[PDB]
């Protein structure tokens, strides 16, 4: 049994009536409870994420099955049985908060690992590749996919114009327009690091690594017609599903695998191993099991924990480092940059974002300083032995630079179509039909020249792929 | 034929590639175009409206048919044929930005008139009454209706708990759970001022006024089943419809009517004429035609114009004033208050929000001062005749206060159930069945005590209304 | 012995060198430590207070000597010997952060009492009256006093134009241009509540109250010449003095007195007892001792505690209420309003601003939500007995309204000049000469018409006062 | 003759009285004019600059005397007689907005050139070198200099601790503790680019460049005692002086010179030519005259134009590029970064920050979008020939990279003391005495070990320099 109070701690006498001139008169300015209560209501909302605005979160645990110490010194991977707390957010990409979870889109798969050497964020998607290979293009890509800036409705003519003129998108689109473009929910879904990263071991040796999450629940996808039927009755079915699984004790889980590749394999491959439009052959670079993540606890407050959660690919830990991937390189900047705006300069103090590991440094102040700071010394070097100091046992590697000059230049061996053809051919006949069906419904109303260029990009990937699409769209491509 | 530039006006050499160490190396910090482009993309989003987040805008014109100078000195209403430019936003209420337009909700109907004596905002809804009668309850009402703060899903058990314990809601719920709770689109839809306002003529004489918008396209609604079938294929059908009507020249329009009531009618009535849970009888207070509003122009940019548009019931013009309605009194504060947070201290300089009438005053500075201010004099009184001065020809009326103490107290004659019964009985048999159907689908899963109290509130409105709902829900109300 | 870390908790290997292409090349974007550190440095600053920007804070304790339960139910005043923690900020008014503490100005004297029934802020100044009597004028007054908006330099011509046309300022200026317009420091300085407030006892009986703080160190002032000599060497001497006193154990203190006046004394006085340009006679309404406040602890961090401190006159507690004073009435709004902009929606969770008393309500979210909220119920009324509820034992009084219309109208008996004459005549001859000296150095350069009006205002206060000022300025007052 | 209005354009009836219950009653909430006016007053302030908060601005014109086309393609320098509008802000560094202009500090000298190929900012200081050579140290350096985070008072013990442990500071301190550490005002003052930059001509040939501004009014400095006497009577004398010069038609001016150095001179030198702790010999690299800048117009509004002005060393134009200077490299990021926070995402639309050159790109939205955007196409590549495209005639150079790994490593040939000795010996005997006097008054109270290390750093620069300082401080340095 508790009092309603103001934010000043004064108990509230009447939470029903405003203060007025008699029982039915106009309202007085001297009503601190009314003004405080409205003013805070008036300030509840903060900016949604610029992409991935729609999402849901859960906590759980990651457990190591096979220590990875031969390949990385990462502390959270050092020993069999080692357990690390995680927070995870899943999401769509393009549409705003409140938008349906039945739309075609990659799905976000962002994992925060609270390790003893700092927080490690692996900010993944379900699908293992991406549309583009340079971050400079990201606002363009996003602008083309987002609702039209005049009508506020997504328009295939706009994103197909971009994608067709950005032929490195061809492999991505060959995945996205399979039925795996609409996962059934967040649990029955793949996860992927997408980028090549660098793993560095106790001897300073480096390997390239890729990450894969495989669902215990299996993968399940929705046809366009199954997606429509769900959309009719529930625009939030994936959010609902994730919460409910966990509430009922049916905890979803994923096994983590890696692929590893020596740095020297660059010069022999017919693609760039740090091109995020590429996968690595599972025959040549087999999946190796690392451990299992199980999600087992819903957050206590959606806004405080899921909405305010902040992940960044640049939250790396010793033993794990960026690759040269130019898409990745831009992300290192963009996430903490956007988060300082979306959440405040001190967003890293918000509880879900805090490390378990100790934080000590000489940063200070900023909007909403809540942490009770003390001390006279906020600079280094200083004469005081007890104040925080650098620690040379934790230095990153020093990657070798193969280039001679500061350049703006596409990577060599872009190879935009080959893997797209390999993927196409790996599909079963039923999967190939769904792909063509999905592509056709998306392309049928797009401007003719762009329609043709899309067909030609897919034709370059595989002649049967492109021909089928052309036949299904009524386009005669015999002159070419 | 134009150059791409930076925001500093420097032409861009390469909008495709980041600046790197050779063609495949890591990225350099000295890439102003990359950082500027990403940093602005990272800051595109602002907070959505705390309610009515989903919506769509258009411009048009209002034309007077019958001059209203006998009852109000309002300049825009002074002459037959007088035309005033408007901007209008329509909206849903509860769910966020990308949410479907097929959900049950009141619809917002906000009209900004750009008059020669200032901007006049009539911030209406389709339905003519409201759930509550005091602004102190608005955050509670909203919190109950919004998605649950843990699960992020709306829960009828939550809002029914609030509404049943707020029996003044009974009239509103009787409208909202008719099929008018889901308008077919924004054109085929009623509009209402909801509140009683005061009209004051040039002699200082005051009348109570209510506003009504009647659609030229007629009113049309969706059953739950028709709403689902639309939802399956389009989660923005009403946004689409409004744009498309206007693009194809099929301009939607609404006629404006008023009702007028002498102040002295207060004692003649068994309810409070400034209680926004109440309508006025059209027999006793007939609709009088004022004019017609036609919407004929889509905005050029949805974010700059529709998203950033700011309406407030406190944007009143000479001749038009607030009533004592306690719900209204809170709104006078809340709208500019939230807008200063949502849009900035200087939101009134954003183009859609700017008046056509001249603005001159002594306010200054604030975030994003873009208006090229000049002059040494930013205070009044001052000794300079050419500086802006108050003008005593534009004073508001001085309403009489009947109460003699500052109190927090419910209005006399709340009369929470009578008009709800009158509405119920005014429904056709088919409308009554839809109401009971809609209510039953919403109530069938809520907690048993709350379910019973709902039935009792509707029973107090009308015995048949309540009995039908009880029978349909399998609740035995014979002991009461 | 501690590691320097990133905000993610990763130890820092090198806090001296940026990451670069060889030992002397350009810098890489993949340097999370560099970018995090700079980005947080780039965001250290928040807006300064719109007035009273320069100031200093300390903590201490207030101890009751005479219990006040006969006149107020205020819990912190209920018993002899009862101790309440305080936080206090002292300040100048007009110039920005960083400005000298040797300038002429009122001094702020803001006391936050952390009481068992909520925080009580008494937001005072040293001087016991104010320039103006209506909050609508405050931005005008402040704009006139502040540096000129073109030159960034304060201009006596500007504020004397305002003040002369605002003759209710005459009493204030007669205090401010004594040498008490430059206190020697914050310890040897008066405090005042300025406004009349209402004290309400357990029986519901109300008295008017005024507050006075009397320094144990005595009151001491600086002549213009003594101020200049200090200014030459120290532009923060008062901040320095306060800190150093407390560090050396020489704790400054003030005794609190009140005056009490029956409500019925309105009608027989020749001024309005709620006009903040007026004092109450100490002969007719004697000072009654309440207790002593001692300041004994410096804050641990100036930004987190003093810069972010938030006081409002509307932070009232049961037994202490606003008066009708129209200056006060505007302050009730303005302080929490500016603080939400200056500090954030959730400024009340910043540690110095937190109550000791429990806080429970249904407000939620907002920028920087750090309080780990939980629970499904964020609305009232609700069906749960354990959730926070209103408590009717804590209702404010219901002041009687004498007026019967909503009006914009000056108070009756403004009496602008009488107390200014009484003050003048209460000065010793030496104090009178300092006043005329101080006034003359301020007025000598202002425009001739405004100069004359100032003389006339002070002449209306007292003929000798005005004649002396005229003589000293070389102004011929014979025509008038 | 004009009306006072609200921001809605409604004329104001009464700018003197709040709306109240009778002439002496409490205030009503329905007073839009009061609430709008107070609310905007409450939001006037934005964050001050994190450094250089105190400053003053003026506009003028730069005129080329000698065309520089042989060394740079910069358009504003291409022809004799070519005139370019400038905006210039001068400043102190460490203390806040209202702080005195008589304090020891470098002075900022920031020039914005509104060129036909974009805005070019040359963000200089009076003194030609800096304390540090890597941006990673800047927040440390600044934290040490700034008022103590507990006391709010600057403490020489704190910055001398940092500086003595950062011996690269030794040259800077040898300038700063001459009397040129307190310029007499902003007109009689040097300007410097500080960094080496790269100039690139139309053939792609690169030279290193340094910039120097020489005042037509000559250089004048203040002794500590002269600075104290001015401080006593005016804490804004330099802001006053600049305005007054320009108001009286006495326009200050500076001639611009450069030094040029071939890239191949790197091996010829015993220091790194891109180390900002170093100058270049005027004998070996003579000053070459470019043109003259005259300041001739005060701004119209100090807040709108000076306070909201935004400069960045990264606002470069074709023909002018960064060097590899690691201090510079951090600055490229930090200025726009801080500005987005201080001013808003759209700060580049604030009138003073706008280019004269056309701006066309695909960025959109952000807080306070006032630019009336239109169009469906906000992405590139796109199929439309009329939309903005990259232009390959405006590419930056491609500087050669000498290093072959990503490293964190001090430059070779830091040479921390030699130029400090050369500067010392260049002083006249009177200048040497003022240096020692100034140093002694700053050092006499710092901790003994730090005091000794300072003496040793200056001794390493020049034995006489260090001996004199030691004698003056009573420190016996026999034993070293
Ligand atoms: C209508 C009249 C007045 C208005 C509109 C007004 C408004 C304000 C505002 C906006 C602030 C900044 C608050 C913050 O950012 O935390 C402030 C500070 C202050 N005001 Fe006033 N004020 C008024 C009259 C007075 C009076 C009469 C006094 C004393 C009796 C006073 C004493 C103070 C003090 C001491 C502070 C600084 C509190 C602190 O240390 O943070 N003001 N005022
Ligand atoms: C790594 C070294 C440095 C860093 C991180 C740094 C950072 C900053 C920042 C963040 C600002 C605020 C800018 C704004 O609010 O718009 C600033 C202002 C300034 N800095 Fe630096 N700075 C550095 C070195 C220098 C140098 C070498 C100079 C001169 C050569 C200098 C001169 C200035 C000036 C003049 C301003 C104020 C510009 C204005 O008037 O608006 N700084 N600095
Ligand atoms: O993110 C995407 C969603 C849907 C698409 O059709 C293409 C991209
Ligand atoms: O705004 C509302 C929407 C749906 C409801 O069932 C009740 C209120
Ligand atoms: O606050 C004030 C300072 C100086 C003045 O001359 C008047 C008021
Ligand atoms: O920036 C500075 C200010 C004061 C000092 O004594 C030294 C440097
Ligand atoms: Cl740090
Ligand atoms: Cl104004
Ligand atoms: Cl705000
Ligand atoms: Cl509440
Ligand atoms: Cl930001
Ligand atoms: Cl762009
Ligand atoms: Na007529
Ligand atoms: Na007692």
């Amino acid at each position: 049994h508790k009092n309603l109070t103001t934010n000043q701690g004064v108990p509230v006498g009447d939470n029903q009536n405003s203060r007025t001139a008699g029982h039915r008169g106009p309202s007085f300015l001297d009503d601190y409870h009314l003004i405080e209560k409205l003013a805070h209501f008036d300030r509840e909302r903060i900016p949604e994420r610029v992409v991935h605005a729609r999402g849901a979160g859960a906590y759980g645990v990651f457990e190591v099955e096979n220590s990875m110490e031969k390949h990385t010194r990462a502390a959270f991977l050092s020993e069999e049985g080692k357990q690390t707390d995680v927070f995870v957010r899943f999401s769509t990409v393009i549409h705003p908060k409140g938008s349906p979870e039945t739309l075609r889109d990659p799905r976000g798969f962002a994992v925060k690992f609270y390790t003893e050497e700092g927080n490690y964020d692996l900010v993944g998607n379900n699908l293992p590749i991406f549309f583009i290979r340079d971050a400079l293009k990201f606002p363009d890509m996003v602008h083309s996919l987002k609702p039209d800036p005049v009508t506020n409705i997504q328009d295939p003519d706009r994103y197909w114009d971009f994608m067709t003129l950005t032929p490195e998108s061809t492999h991505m689109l060959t995945w996205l327009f399979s039925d795996e473009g609409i996962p059934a929910n967040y649990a029955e879904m793949r996860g992927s690091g997408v980028h090549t990263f660098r793993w560095v071991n106790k001897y300073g040796e480096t390997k390239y690594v890729k990450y894969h999450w495989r669902p215990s629940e299996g993968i399940r996808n929705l046809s366009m017609e199954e997606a429509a039927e769900i959309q009719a009755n529930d625009f939030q079915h994936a959010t609902r599903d994730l919460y409910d699984r966990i509430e009922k004790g049916n905890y979803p889980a994923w096994d983590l695998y890696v692929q590893l590749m020596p740095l020297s394999d660059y010069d022999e491959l017919d693609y760039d191993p740090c091109d995020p439009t590429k996968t690595w052959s599972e025959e040549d670079y087999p999946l190796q099991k690392v451990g299992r993540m199980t999600l087992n606890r819903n957050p206590e407050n959606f806004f405080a924990e899921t909405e305010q959660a902040a992940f960044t690919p640049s939250a790396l830990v010793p033993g794990i480092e960026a690759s040269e991937d130019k898409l990745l390189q831009g992300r290192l900047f963009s996430y903490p940059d956007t988060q300082r705006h979306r959440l405040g300069a001190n967003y890293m103090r918000i509880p879900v974002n805090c490390p378990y590991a100790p934080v000590h440094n000489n940063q200070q102040d900023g909007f909403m300083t809540t942490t009770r700071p003390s001390g006279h010394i906020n600079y280094e070097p200083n004469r005081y032995d007890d104040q925080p100091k650098e620690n040379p046992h934790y230095k990153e590697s020093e990657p070798v630079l193969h280039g001679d000059r500061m350049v703006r230049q596409k990577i060599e061996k872009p190879n935009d179509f080959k893997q797209a053809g390999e993927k196409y051919r790996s599909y079963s006949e039923e999967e190939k039909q769904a792909l063509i069906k999905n592509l056709t419904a998306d392309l049928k109303g797009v401007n003719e020249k762009t329609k043709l260029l899309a067909i030609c990009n897919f034709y370059r990937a595989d002649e049967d792929y492109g021909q089928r699409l052309a036949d299904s769209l009524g386009v005669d491509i015999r002159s070419y």
Side-chain angles (χ1 to χ4, degrees), chain A:
Chain A
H1 278 218
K2 273 185 257 58
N3 294 326
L4 219 40
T5 69
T6 69
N7 300 331
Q8 304 280 354
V10 174
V12 165
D14 188 336
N15 195 44
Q16 315 320 312
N17 303 295
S18 297
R19 200 179 193 201
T20 61
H23 72 82
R24 70 174 308 279
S27 287
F28 286 112
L29 185 59
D30 180 20
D31 191 341
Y32 174 88
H33 178 44
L34 177 68
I35 301 303
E36 187 190 76
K37 187 187 180 170
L38 284 182
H40 200 279
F41 176 81
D42 290 341
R43 286 168 180 77
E44 286 187 9
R45 302 290 174 260
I46 71 175
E48 71 178 25
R49 294 161 180 73
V50 67
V51 286
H52 297 251
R54 163 67 89 183
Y59 296 86
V61 176
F62 179 76
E63 193 179 330
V64 177
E65 171 170 8
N66 299 305
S67 140
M68 291 288 123
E69 74 83 46
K70 290 192 260 282
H71 310 297
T72 176
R73 72 192 198 261
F76 84 100
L77 296 181
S78 60
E79 308 291 341
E80 284 75 25
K82 196 167 196 172
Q83 293 177 349
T84 300
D85 285 356
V86 295
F87 178 79
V88 180
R89 188 169 177 280
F90 303 108
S91 58
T92 62
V93 177
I94 294 293
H95 292 264
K97 269 182 86 47
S99 60
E101 289 168 324
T102 43
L103 305 184
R104 189 172 304 284
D105 245 350
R107 263 57 178 178
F109 197 128
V111 185
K112 179 181 297 304
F113 295 87
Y114 297 96
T115 93
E116 316 160 297
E117 291 191 337
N119 286 359
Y120 172 49
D121 287 335
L122 183 63
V123 186
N125 268 347
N126 68 327
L127 306 177
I129 49 162
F130 209 63
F131 306 95
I132 51 168
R133 56 163 70 99
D134 198 308
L136 188 57
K137 300 317 294 184
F138 190 70
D140 299 297
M141 183 199 94
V142 174
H143 283 185
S144 82
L145 285 163
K146 284 269 177 172
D148 177 296
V150 186
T151 73
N152 201 217
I153 303 182
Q154 180 178 69
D155 185 353
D157 190 62
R158 300 173 76 258
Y159 58 81
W160 280 108
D161 180 33
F162 180 84
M163 293 300 163
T164 58
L165 294 170
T166 301
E168 61 259 55
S169 63
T170 305
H171 192 194
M172 187 59 163
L173 300 169
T174 304
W175 289 73
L176 179 66
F177 280 88
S178 80
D179 292 334
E180 196 175 358
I182 314 177
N185 56 63
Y186 296 134
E188 298 177 70
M189 183 184 78
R190 196 193 301 259
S192 312
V194 182
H195 306 284
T196 301
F197 292 93
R198 288 180 172 237
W199 267 11
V200 186
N201 70 9
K202 70 188 176 287
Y203 296 116
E205 304 168 322
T206 299
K207 303 272 182 178
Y208 286 139
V209 68
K210 282 203 190 267
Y211 293 104
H212 305 274
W213 293 106
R214 316 229 311 261
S216 63
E217 300 295 336
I219 292 169
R220 177 209 167 176
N221 301 138
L222 306 179
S223 63
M224 293 182 294
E225 21 289 306
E226 287 175 294
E229 179 273 8
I230 293 171
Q231 190 168 300
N233 296 139
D234 202 349
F235 61 107
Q236 326 132 287
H237 79 285
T239 287
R240 184 198 300 280
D241 175 87
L242 176 60
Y243 191 90
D244 286 358
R245 273 174 202 269
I246 295 178
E247 198 182 51
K248 281 143 155 324
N250 184 18
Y251 304 138
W254 288 262
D255 293 327
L256 182 65
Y257 297 74
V258 296
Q259 300 173 284
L260 296 160
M261 169 187 294
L263 293 183
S264 55
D265 271 11
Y266 176 87
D267 302 282
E268 77 165 20
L269 290 164
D270 72 359
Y271 62 89
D272 183 327
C274 296
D275 176 355
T277 66
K278 302 296 183 286
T279 51
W280 298 351
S281 159
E282 295 183 7
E283 284 69 47
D284 301 333
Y285 301 99
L287 297 178
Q288 304 188 53
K289 195 166 175 200
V290 184
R292 188 176 187 88
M293 174 171 71
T294 304
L295 305 184
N296 68 9
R297 178 170 56 96
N298 283 317
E300 297 276 354
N301 182 270
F302 184 91
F303 175 92
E305 296 168 69
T306 302
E307 186 65 26
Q308 282 192 140
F311 303 87
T312 173
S314 49
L316 294 157
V317 292
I320 312 177
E321 290 181 24
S323 80
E324 46 271 44
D325 175 333
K326 298 184 192 171
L327 193 68
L328 176 56
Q329 295 271 311
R331 292 178 82 208
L332 306 171
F333 171 66
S334 168
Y335 290 67
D337 185 57
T338 199
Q339 282 146 16
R340 296 166 189 124
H341 155 85
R342 180 170 69 81
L343 298 163
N346 292 308
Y347 76 96
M348 289 298 300
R349 301 308 193 162
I350 288 168
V352 67
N353 299 324
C354 297
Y356 286 14
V359 176
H360 302 295
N361 61 48
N362 288 134
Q363 296 182 26
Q364 71 183 7
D365 306 349
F367 266 118
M368 290 286 302
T369 294
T370 55
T371 45
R372 303 183 176 267
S374 62
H376 287 262
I377 312 300
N378 57 0
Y379 64 89
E380 193 278 333
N382 58 67
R383 72 170 89 95
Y384 307 95
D385 286 341
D386 61 307
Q387 294 293 122
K389 305 292 177 175
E390 74 199 21
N391 189 327
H393 186 255
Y394 299 96
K395 292 209 68 167
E396 60 231 309
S397 80
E398 296 180 337
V400 169
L401 303 171
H402 302 300
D404 247 329
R405 286 178 164 259
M406 308 176 86
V407 305
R408 291 195 192 262
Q409 203 181 351
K410 195 199 289 195
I411 61 171
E412 308 284 12
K413 42 183 179 175
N415 215 163
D416 285 339
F417 307 102
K418 180 167 153 177
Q419 293 203 341
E422 295 171 325
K423 183 62 181 184
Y424 174 79
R425 295 188 285 273
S426 72
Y427 286 139
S428 74
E429 173 58 28
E430 182 280 303
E431 288 174 309
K432 287 188 174 86
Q433 293 179 26
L435 173 61
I436 295 305
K437 180 193 206 282
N438 293 339
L439 281 172
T440 293
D442 221 61
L443 276 166
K444 65 180 200 266
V446 158
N447 138 296
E448 284 308 300
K449 178 170 68 175
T450 295
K451 195 188 287 176
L452 185 60
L453 180 56
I455 290 168
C456 295
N457 287 336
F458 296 126
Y459 189 92
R460 293 185 208 107
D462 177 283
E463 294 191 353
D464 186 74
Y465 186 2
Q467 186 65 58
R468 282 163 89 143
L469 183 50
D471 294 344
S472 181
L473 284 161
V475 174
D476 172 18
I477 48 165
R478 275 177 309 162
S479 75
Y480 338 87

